[PDB]
Design a protein around this ligand. Structure first.
Ligand code: HEM
Ligand code: HEM
Ligand SMILES: *[C@@H]1O[C@H](CO)[C@@H](O[C@@H]2O[C@H](CO)[C@@H](O)[C@H](O)[C@H]2NC(C)=O)[C@H](O)[C@H]1NC(C)=O
Ligand SMILES: *[C@@H]1O[C@H](CO)[C@@H](O[C@@H]2O[C@H](CO)[C@@H](O)[C@H](O)[C@H]2NC(C)=O)[C@H](O)[C@H]1NC(C)=O
Ligand SMILES: *[C@@H]1O[C@H](CO)[C@@H](O[C@@H]2O[C@H](CO)[C@@H](O)[C@H](O)[C@H]2NC(C)=O)[C@H](O)[C@H]1NC(C)=O
Ligand SMILES: *[C@@H]1O[C@H](CO)[C@@H](O)[C@H](O)[C@H]1NC(C)=O
Ligand SMILES: *[C@@H]1O[C@H](CO)[C@@H](O)[C@H](O)[C@H]1NC(C)=O
Ligand SMILES: *[C@@H]1O[C@H](CO)[C@@H](O)[C@H](O)[C@H]1NC(C)=O
Ligand SMILES: *[C@@H]1O[C@H](CO)[C@@H](O)[C@H](O)[C@H]1NC(C)=O
Ligand SMILES: [Ca+2]
Ligand SMILES: [Ca+2]
Ligand SMILES: [Ca+2]
Ligand SMILES: [Ca+2]
Ligand SMILES: [Ca+2]
Ligand SMILES: [Ca+2]
Lengths: 288, 320, 141, 143, 320
C-alpha cells in the first residue's frame, strides 16, 4: 500500500509511499513530520486583537518557578524558541541550562502542559537573547498546536507588519488570561538604536531608554514600533515570535523572537532578535 | 451545472445528518470551518426542511468519506444554495474527514420538552430532547419570559410562570440549551434566541426549571412570630413548603409581602421569635421588583427552587 | 508614550495638584488599600487604618516622587532609578499593584480636580502614570 | 463574593443620582480616548481620532447609554451577575471578540467617571464597593 | 569654493533651520560637535541673514538626510563662509543625523519684546516676537536676573525688577522662551541661555512677566490691625493693590517686612483683627527671604502676580 498520514503533517520520504519492500528506497518506512506555520484558522500585549480562533498555534506559555508567565515559540514538533532572559528568571546569572530546565513549565495549545527534556542557551546569549527548549516528546500538531516556520528570507525590512502574539501583561499589568496579538510594523533600525542608545555611534551611545532598562541592540536584532492604536508588547511577551505572514506562499514565519518586552507602551519599539541570524545555530542544535 | 443534488447522511432522517454535496460525479462533504447557524439555515432551506435547529462539525453524525468540496464559507443567511457563499475555492480545503459539518433541521428534528422531578406535572426541572437525547437547560439568562414560553409549549395553566426547578436535583446528561432569550411570544423554547445547542458555560447545579400555575396554589405566610404579620416568610407553592432566601431581599420586597398579607409597610427584615419552626430544602428567590406590587407573585422574575440559600440566610419580616 | 501635548497636560494637572499632592497621594493609598486589599501585603509594618499617619507620610512620599517625575518627564528613568531599583528588587512589588495604584491616583485626581480632569487630561495622566509604573516595574524579575 | 448590605446601600445611593443619559457616554468616550485600541471595535461610529470627536460622537453617547443600562441591570442583580450577563458575554466573546481586560478597563474608566462626577461623595469606601461591582460585571461578562 | 550653496531647512523662514550644504551635488548636514554661536555667526553672515540669534544641534529642526559634511568646525567668527573653518574633513565625522546643527538668524527671527496687560507701560505679561508672531514666556526658570535683563531691554527703570505678570491674564498663541537663564547683564532676553524656541511643556497660565520700577512706587503697609505695623500685609506696586501669599511666609519674611516698615522684629504671623480689608485678586509671592533684608523688595524672586493663592491665605503679621 501507500503510506500517507493525517492532516497537519507532510510525508518525509524520498519516493512516494507505495510498498514490505519499497521499490524506491527499500524498507525505509518513512515517518511524516509536521507542517511549517500553516494555522488552520489564521489571524487577520497592552492592546487587543483577542486570539479567539487560536490563530497562533506556535505560541507557548512558559511559566517560571516564581510564577512569571513568559513566551515561547514552537519552531518544530519538539523544540521551541524563547529568550535567554526568559530561562534565567529566578536563576543565578551563573546558572547553567541543566538546572534551568526542571524549573520551567510549558503550555502549548489551550493549556496542554508539555514536559521539557532539555534547555540549551545561545552561546552568545548576552548578545543574542535566545534559548532553545526541547520537549521530552514531540508535541501532537493540531489546529491549536503547530510549529511556526523558520524563514528562508529576511522579512525584517522596514514597514513589514508581523503579528506578535503574547502571554504577557496587559494594560492592567495583569498577565493575560487569553492569548492576544498585535500587528506591529518593523521600524527603522537607526531610529530604534537612537531611541534606546544615544546616537548609533558607539562613542556617543548613552543609556537613553524611556524605560529603566536597556535592550540588547546589535546586528542580530530588529525593532517593531507600536501599532496604529498605540499598543505594544509588555512584560511576559518576550520569547514570542514576530510572526510574518508571507502572502506569496500563505505561510507564517518567525521573523524575530521578542527579546525586549519591557517596552510596554513607554518605549516606542520592542526589540526582536532576528531568527535568520540564529537560524544556523538553531538548526545545528536540533541536529543534536 | 445547476444540477448538484445534496443529501444528509447518517442523521436519523432526511433533514438531519452530515452535509454531502455531489459535484463532478462524486459525493463530497463540507468543512465545519466558519460554520454557524447561517450555513445551517441555508442547508435546511435547500432541502425545504424548514429553519435550522442547529449545526454540527465535530463529526458527531459520523466520519466523512470523499472529496471535501467546501472549507471556508461566508454565508450571511439569505442564499439560494450552499454553493453561493464565498467558498474560497472548489475542492480546495485544509480539513480532514473528521472535520466535516452536519446540520439538524426543523422538519427532521425530534425536539421535545418535558418536566421531571417536580411537585406537580406543571413544575420541575426543564428537560429538552435533542436528537432523541434528553438534556437540561442552564438557568443563565432563564427568565419569566422563557418560563412563560415553556409553560405555554408544554401545556398546563400558564397564568403564573416561575423559573427554577421545584425541589429537583441536579440533572444528568447534556446541557443542550443555554442563555435562552424569549420575548414571550415564541411558540416554543427553541425558536427563541439562545446559545448554540450543547454549547454552554454552566453545570448541572445551574439546571433551569419552570413552575406553571394559575395562581390558586401559591400561598405565602409568616411563621414563627406569633403574629400573622411577623416571622419568617414561609411560601406554599403547589403544596410544597418553602421559605424565601434573603439574597436580593431588601425592605421593598418585605413591604410587598406585608401588603400581600395586608399589614401596611415593612419595618425590619427581622422578627422577635415566638416559636420554633422547621427547615425546608427549597427556597424562593427574588431577583428584584419595584416594591409597589399588590402581591409578591406579581413582581417580576421570582425563582422557586433550583438554588441553595446556604451562603445567604432565610428571609424574615415584621410588618405593622 | 508621552506626547508633548500629553506632557503639557500632565505638567498642568500636577501644577494644579500643587500643595495638595501629599494628601492626594495619601487618599490614593487609602483607596488602593480598601479597593484592592491584596496590595496591603506590601505594607505589613504600616497602620493601614483610615487617616493613618504612616499612610499619610507614605502618600506624601509617593506624591513627591510623582512631582519629581513630572519635573523630569523627559528623564523619568533617571529620576526614578532609585525607586525603580527599590520597588523592582528590594520590595519586589508586582506590576499589577502599580496599575492599581495608578488607577487610584486617577480616581483621586478626578474626585479632587473635576474641572481639570478632561478626557484629554485623563488620557495624559493615565499615560504618565503608566510611564511611571513601567519605569518602576521594569527591573522586576 | 456577596456584597455587604452597607456596600450595596452605598452603591445604590450613588447610582440613583447617576445621569444615565450622560455617564455611560462619558465612560465609553473616555475608554476610547485613553485606551485607543478600543476604538477598533467602534470603527462604525464615525470620527474617533480627536478626544473631542470621541466625546462628541452621538453614536458613542448612545452606545455608552446602552452600556450603562447594562451596568444598571447588573446592579439590580448583583447577586446573579453571570446569569444576567450571559448573553452579553457571549456576544462580546463570539460576535465581537472583545478582550475581557477591556471590560475591566471600562469598569475602571467608569469608576473614574463616577469620581469625576461626584467629587468627595465618591469616598474610598464607596469606590471599593464600586470596584467590587465593576469587577463582578467584568468577570460575569468574560470567558 | 565658488560652487558651494548652502541653505537652512525646516526653520519657519529661510534664515532658520538645519544647515545643509551642497557638495558633489548632494545636500548634506553639519554636526553639532564643537558647534557654538561663532559657527552660527559665520553661517548667518554667509547667507546674508544678519547676526546669529541662536544655534541648535540635536536635530531640533528635524533629522537631516544625506552625508554629514563637517564634524569639528573650528570657527572663530570672522569666516566668509562655513566651508572655510578648519574642520577635520569633507564628510569625515563621528556623527549621526540626530546631531545636525541648525541656526536661527537675526533678520529671519526679527525679535522684539513688549509688556502687555499691566498696570503700567513697564509692567505686565512679557511677550516676545519670534519670526513674525508674538508669543509669551514660560515662568519656569524666570527669576529676577531675567526680569532685570528684560527691563533694561525694554529700556525703563531697572532699579527693582520683579517677576510675574502683575495682573495680566494668560497670553494667547505661542509660548516661545522657557527656562531663560540670564546672568542679569545680557543686552537682550535672547542672548541668555534658554531652551529652544517653543520646546517646552508649559501652558499660558505660566506666562512670565516683569515689573520694571525705579524703587519709588512700591509701597507696603499693614491694614486691618488697629496699628500702622500690625495687620495684613497690603502691597501697592504701581498703584495696584494686592496682598502677600502666605505660602512660605514664616518669621524670616515677616521680620523683613517689619524691618521695612520700621517696627522691630516680627512677633506673630497673625493679628488681632480690628477692621476688614478690601478684596484684591493680585498677590505677592516670596520664594525665600534670608531674613536680614532691609526691605521686602530685596528678597529673591518675589512674583507680583501671575500665580493663584487659592489654598493659601493672605500673609498677616504683628510686629512690635
Ligand atoms: C506611581 C507609583 C509609585 C510611586 C511613585 C512610588 C513611590 C515610592 C516612594 C517615594 C517610596 C519611599 C521609599 C523611600 O523614600 O526610600 C516608596 C516606598 C514603598 N513603596 Fe512605592 N511607589 C509606587 C508604587 C507602589 C505600589 C503600587 C506599591 C504596593 C502595592 C508600592 C510599595 C511600596 C513599599 C512597600 C514601600 C516601602 C515603604 C516603607 O517601607 O516605608 N509602591 N514608594
Ligand atoms: C464593561 C462592561 C460592558 C458592558 C456592560 C457592555 C454592554 C453592552 C451592551 C448592552 C451592548 C448592546 C448589545 C446589543 O446591541 O445587542 C454592547 C455591545 C457592544 N459592546 Fe459592550 N459593554 C461593555 C464593555 C465593552 C467594551 C470594553 C467594549 C470594547 C472595547 C465593548 C464593545 C462593544 C461593541 C463593539 C458592541 C456592539 C456595537 C453595536 O452594537 O453598535 N463593550 N455592550
Ligand atoms: C525565586 O522565587 C522565590 C519566591 O519568590 C524566592 O524566594 C524568596 O527570596 C526572598 C529573597 O531572598 C526571600 O525574602 C523570601 O523569603 C523567599 N521566599 C521563599 C523562599 O519562599 C527566590 O529567592 C527566587 N530565586 C531567585 C531570585 O534566584
Ligand atoms: C418533589 O416533591 C414531589 C411531591 O412531594 C415528589 O414527588 C413524590 O415523590 C414521592 C417519593 O419520594 C412519591 O411517593 C410521590 O408519589 C411523589 N408525588 C408526586 C406528585 O410526584 C418529588 O419526588 C420531589 N422531588 C425531589 C425530592 O427531588
Ligand atoms: C491690569 O490693570 C491695568 C491698569 O489698571 C489695566 O489697564 C487699564 O485698563 C482700563 C480699562 O478698564 C483702562 O481704563 C486703563 O487706562 C488701563 N490702564 C493702563 C495703565 O493701561 C489692565 O486692563 C488690567 N489687566 C487685567 C485686569 O487683565
Ligand atoms: C506558584 O504558583 C503555584 C500554584 O499556581 C504555587 O503552588 C507556588 O507556591 C507558587 N510559587 C511562588 C514562588 O509564588
Ligand atoms: C558567538 O560569537 C562568535 C564571535 O563573536 C561567533 O563566531 C559565533 O558564531 C557566535 N555563536 C553562534 C552560535 O553563532
Ligand atoms: C409600580 O410602578 C411601576 C413604575 O416603575 C409601574 O409600571 C407599575 O404599574 C406600578 N405597579 C402598581 C401596582 O402600581
Ligand atoms: C544676609 O545674610 C547672608 C548670609 O545668610 C549674607 O550672604 C548677606 O550678605 C546678608 N545680607 C545683608 C544685607 O547683610
Ligand atoms: Ca474546523
Ligand atoms: Ca479552513
Ligand atoms: Ca446560573
Ligand atoms: Ca554632538
Ligand atoms: Ca566629533
Ligand atoms: Ca512654572
Amino acid at each position: 500500500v501507500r503510506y500517507q498520514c493525517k492532516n497537519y503533517y507532510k510525508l518525509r520520504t524520498e519516493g512516494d509511499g507505495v510498498y514490505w519492500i519499497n521499490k524506491a528506497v527499500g524498507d525505509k518506512l518513512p515517518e511524516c513530520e509536521a507542517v511549517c506555520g500553516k494555522p488552520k484558522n489564521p489571524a487577520n500585549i497592552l492592546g487587543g486583537h483577542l486570539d479567539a480562533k487560536g490563530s497562533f498555534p506556535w505560541q507557548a506559555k512558559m511559566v517560571s518557578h516564581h510564577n512569571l508567565t513568559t513566551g515561547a515559540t514552537l519552531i518544530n514538533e519538539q523544540w521551541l524558541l524563547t529568550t535567554a532572559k526568559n530561562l534565567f528568571l529566578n536563576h543565578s546569572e551563573n546558572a547553567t541550562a541543566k538546572d534551568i530546565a526542571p524549573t520551567l513549565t510549558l503550555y502549548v495549545g489551550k493549556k496542554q502542559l508539555v514536559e521539557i527534556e532539555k534547555v540549551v542557551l545561545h552561546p552568545n546569549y548576552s548578545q543574542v537573547d535566545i534559548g532553545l527548549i526541547k520537549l521530552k516528546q514531540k508535541v501532537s500538531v493540531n489546529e491549536r498546536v503547530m510549529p511556526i516556520c523558520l524563514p528562508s528570507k529576511d522579512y525584517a525590512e522596514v514597514g513589514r507588519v508581523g503579528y506578535v502574539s503574547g502571554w504577557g501583561r496587559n494594560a492592567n499589568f495583569k498577565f493575560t488570561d487569553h492569548l492576544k496579538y498585535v500587528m506591529l510594523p518593523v521600524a527603522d533600525q537607526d531610529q530604534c538604536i537612537r531611541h534606546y542608545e544615544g546616537s548609533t555611534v558607539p562613542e556617543k551611545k548613552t543609556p537613553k531608554s524611556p524605560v529603566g532598562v536597556q535592550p540588547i541592540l546589535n546586528e542580530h536584532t530588529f525593532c517593531a514600533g507600536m501599532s496604529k492604536y498605540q499598543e505594544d508588547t509588555c512584560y511576559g511577551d518576550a520569547g514570542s515570535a514576530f510572526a510574518v505572514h508571507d502572502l506569496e506562499e500563505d505561510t507564517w514565519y518567525a521573523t524575530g523572537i521578542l527579546s525586549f518586552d519591557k517596552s510596554c507602551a513607554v518605549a516606542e519599539y520592542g526589540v526582536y532578535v532576528k531568527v535568520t541570524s540564529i537560524q544556523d545555530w538553531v538548526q545545528k542544535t536540533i541536529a543534536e | 451545472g445547476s444540477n448538484l443534488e445534496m443529501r444528509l447522511t447518517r442523521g436519523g432522517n432526511m433533514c438531519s445528518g452530515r452535509i454531502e454535496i455531489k459535484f463532478q460525479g462524486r459525493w463530497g462533504t463540507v468543512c465545519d470551518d466558519n460554520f454557524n447557524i447561517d450555513h445551517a439555515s441555508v442547508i435546511c432551506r435547500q432541502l425545504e426542511c424548514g429553519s435550522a435547529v442547529s449545526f454540527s462539525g465535530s463529526s458527531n453524525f459520523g466520519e466523512g468519506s470523499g472529496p471535501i468540496w467546501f472549507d471556508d464559507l461566508i454565508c450571511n443567511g439569505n442564499e439560494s444554495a450552499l454553493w453561493n457563499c464565498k467558498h474560497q475555492g472548489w475542492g480546495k480545503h485544509n480539513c480532514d474527514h473528521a472535520e466535516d459539518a452536519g446540520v439538524i433541521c426543523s422538519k427532521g428534528a425530534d425536539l421535545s420538552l418535558r418536566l421531571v422531578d417536580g411537585v406537580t406535572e406543571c413544575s420541575g426541572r426543564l428537560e429538552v430532547r435533542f436528537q432523541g437525547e434528553w438534556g437540561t437547560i442552564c438557568d443563565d439568562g432563564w427568565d419569566s419570559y422563557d418560563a412563560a414560553v415553556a409553560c405555554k409549549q408544554l401545556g398546563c395553566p400558564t397564568a403564573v410562570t416561575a423559573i427554577g426547578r421545584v425541589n429537583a436535583s441536579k440533572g444528568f446528561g447534556h446541557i443542550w440549551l443555554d442563555s435562552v432569550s424569549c420575548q414571550g411570544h415564541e411558540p416554543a423554547i427553541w425558536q427563541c434566541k439562545h446559545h448554540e445547542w450543547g454549547k454552554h458555560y454552566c453545570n448541572h447545579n445551574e439546571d433551569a426549571g419552570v413552575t406553571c400555575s394559575d395562581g390558586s396554589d401559591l400561598e405565602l405566610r409568616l411563621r414563627g412570630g406569633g403574629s400573622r404579620c411577623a416571622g419568617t416568610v414561609e411560601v406554599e407553592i403547589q403544596r410544597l413548603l418553602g421559605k424565601v432566601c434573603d439574597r436580593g431581599w431588601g425592605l421593598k420586597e418585605a413591604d410587598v409581602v406585608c401588603r400581600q398579607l395586608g399589614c401596611g409597610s415593612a419595618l425590619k427584615t427581622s422578627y422577635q421569635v415566638y416559636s420554633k419552626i422547621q427547615a425546608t430544602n427549597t427556597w424562593l428567590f427574588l431577583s428584584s421588583c419595584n416594591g409597589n406590587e399588590t402581591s409578591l407573585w406579581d413582581c417580576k422574575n421570582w425563582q422557586w427552587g433550583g438554588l441553595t440559600c446556604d451562603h445567604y440566610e432565610e428571609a424574615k419580616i415584621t410588618c405593622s | 508614550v508621552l506626547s508633548p501635548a500629553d506632557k503639557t497636560n500632565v505638567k498642568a494637572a500636577w501644577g494644579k495638584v500643587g500643595a495638595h499632592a501629599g494628601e492626594y497621594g495619601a487618599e490614593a493609598l487609602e483607596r488602593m488599600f480598601l479597593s484592592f486589599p491584596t496590595t496591603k501585603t506590601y505594607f505589613p509594618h504600616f497602620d493601614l487604618s483610615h487617616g493613618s499617619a504612616q499612610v499619610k507620610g507614605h502618600g506624601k512620599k509617593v506624591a513627591d516622587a510623582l512631582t519629581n517625575a513630572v519635573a523630569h518627564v523627559d528623564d523619568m528613568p533617571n529620576a526614578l532609578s532609585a525607586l525603580s531599583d527599590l520597588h523592582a528588587h528590594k520590595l519586589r512589588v508586582d506590576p499589577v499593584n502599580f496599575k492599581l495604584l495608578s488607577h487610584c491616583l486617577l480616581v483621586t485626581l478626578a474626585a479632587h480636580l473635576p474641572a481639570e480632569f478632561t478626557p484629554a487630561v485623563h488620557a495624559s495622566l493615565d499615560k504618565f502614570l503608566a510611564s511611571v509604573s513601567t519605569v518602576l516595574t521594569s527591573k522586576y524579575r | 463574593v456577596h456584597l455587604t448590605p452597607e456596600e450595596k446601600s452605598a452603591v445604590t445611593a450613588l447610582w440613583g443620582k447617576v445621569n444615565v443619559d450622560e455617564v455611560g457616554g462619558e465612560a465609553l468616550g473616555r475608554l476610547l480616548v485613553v485606551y485607543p485600541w478600543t476604538q477598533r471595535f467602534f470603527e462604525s461610529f464615525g470620527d474617533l481620532s480627536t478626544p473631542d470627536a470621541v466625546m462628541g460622537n452621538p453614536k458613542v453617547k448612545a452606545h455608552g447609554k446602552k452600556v450603562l443600562g447594562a451596568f444598571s441591570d447588573g446592579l439590580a442583580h448583583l447577586d446573579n451577575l453571570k446569569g444576567t450577563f450571559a448573553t452579553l458575554s457571549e456576544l462580546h466573546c463570539d460576535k465581537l471578540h472583545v478582550d475581557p481586560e477591556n471590560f475591566r478597563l471600562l469598569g475602571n474608566v467608569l469608576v473614574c467617571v463616577l469620581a469625576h462626577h461626584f467629587g468627595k461623595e465618591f469616598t474610598p469606601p464607596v469606590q471599593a464597593a464600586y470596584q467590587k461591582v465593576v469587577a463582578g460585571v467584568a468577570n460575569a461578562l468574560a470567558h
